[PDB]
Amino acid sequence: GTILIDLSPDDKEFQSVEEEMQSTVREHRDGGHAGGIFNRYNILKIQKVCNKKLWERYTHRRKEVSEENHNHANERMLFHGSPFVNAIIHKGFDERHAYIGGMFGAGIYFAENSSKSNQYVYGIGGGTGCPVHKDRSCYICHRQLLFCRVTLGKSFLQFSMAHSPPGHHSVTGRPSVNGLALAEYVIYRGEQAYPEYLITYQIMRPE
Ligand SMILES: Nc1cccc2c(=O)[nH]c(-c3ccccc3)cc12
Ligand SMILES: [Zn+2]
């Protein structure tokens, strides 16, 4: 039931999604090992992901969480990078999309920094890089990220499928060492995220 609608680059919605993608690149402590070396992206396409059944699954859960949290869903727009992006946009998020070994347990991980999600496009640790050249810093191959609507509800703050900590709907990984890193978030129910935008891009080689 999923259809993908291309956004025009002239569209304010394209421009705002692109700006969030570009403006949340940072340097990574691995020197680029997992995600490659770059300061910005070449955005090739931004598509709106439209699926009525998946949207209603999301809004149903969102209302549940809101009602458990003084009418506050605590909804964010966050990045997700994954080898399973095609399954996700067709079938929705589920336990198969969880990062089993993540530092906050087996859940589905989201980033404020697009460059954090970029590290997972080719797998954990960047896997073996792009399928064509086996290059985690490939500047040729097209990558995809999701920009997702995520319900956090009451989030457990960790200074840094399983179940959420009791009394909570998600976990927040607050960086405590790298002062430039933005937060990361984990949900333990696939129904708490909707993959709203599919972004196709290249990383760009610094000049
Ligand atoms: N640990 C993370 C922090 C912030 C964002 C992500 C992410 O986008 N994907 C992933 C990811 C996605 C699929 C399978 C394994 C890991 C992890 C991640
Ligand atoms: Zn490549």
Curated annotation (Swiss-Prot):
Protein name: Poly [ADP-ribose] polymerase tankyrase-2
Binding site for Zn(2+): 130, 133, 138, 141
Annotated function: Poly-ADP-ribosyltransferase involved in various processes such as Wnt signaling pathway, telomere length and vesicle trafficking. Acts as an activator of the Wnt signaling pathway by mediating poly-ADP-ribosylation of AXIN1 and AXIN2, 2 key components of the beta-catenin destruction complex: poly-ADP-ribosylated target proteins are recognized by RNF146, which mediates their ubiquitination and subsequent degradation. Also mediates poly-ADP-ribosylation of BLZF1 and CASC3, followed by recruitment of RNF146 and subsequent ubiquitination.
Tissue-specificity statement: Highly expressed in placenta, skeletal muscle, liver, brain, kidney, heart, thymus, spinal cord, lung, peripheral blood leukocytes, pancreas, lymph nodes, spleen, prostate, testis, ovary, small intestine, colon, mammary gland, breast and breast carcinoma, and in common-type meningioma. Highly expressed in fetal liver, heart and brain.
Underlying gene: TNKS2
Effect after changing residue 103 to V: Loss of activity
Entry superkingdom: Eukaryota
Domain PARP catalytic: from-to ranges: 8-207
Oligomeric form and interacting partners: Oligomerizes and associates with TNKS. Interacts with the cytoplasmic domain of LNPEP/Otase in SLC2A4/GLUT4-vesicles. Binds to the N-terminus of Grb14 and TRF1 with its ankyrin repeat region. Interacts with HIF1AN. Interacts with RNF146; this interaction leads to ubiquitination and proteasomal degradation. Interacts with NUMA1.
PTM notes: Ubiquitinated at 'Lys-48' and 'Lys-63' by RNF146 when auto-poly-ADP-ribosylated; this leads to degradation. Deubiquitinated by USP25; leading to stabilization. ADP-ribosylated (-auto). Poly-ADP-ribosylated protein is recognized by RNF146, followed by ubiquitination.
Location(s) in or outside the cell: Cytoplasm; Golgi apparatus membrane; Nucleus; Chromosome, Telomere
Family: Belongs to the ARTD/PARP family.
